[PDB]
Amino acid sequence: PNRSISPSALQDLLRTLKSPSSPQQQQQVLNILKSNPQLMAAFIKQRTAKYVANQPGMQ
Numbered sequence: 001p002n003r004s005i006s007p008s009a010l011q012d013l014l015r016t017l018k019s020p021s022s023p024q025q026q027q028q029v030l031n032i033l034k035s036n037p038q039l040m041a042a043f044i045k046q047r048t049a050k051y052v053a054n055q056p057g058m059q
Helices: 007-018 024-035 037-046
Strands: none
Touching: 007 024, 024 037
């Protein structure tokens, strides 16, 4: 398998991400992100709302 990730986790993550009007949003999403680490890695790499997209190749 080149993509041995759990779709059940991803689909459940979608549910959780879309409903933020609850204390569960922060807790559950992060835990689900841990279940599908590749997506967690992407989110962490973006640093949420911090702008770390600064590479010394921009003019």
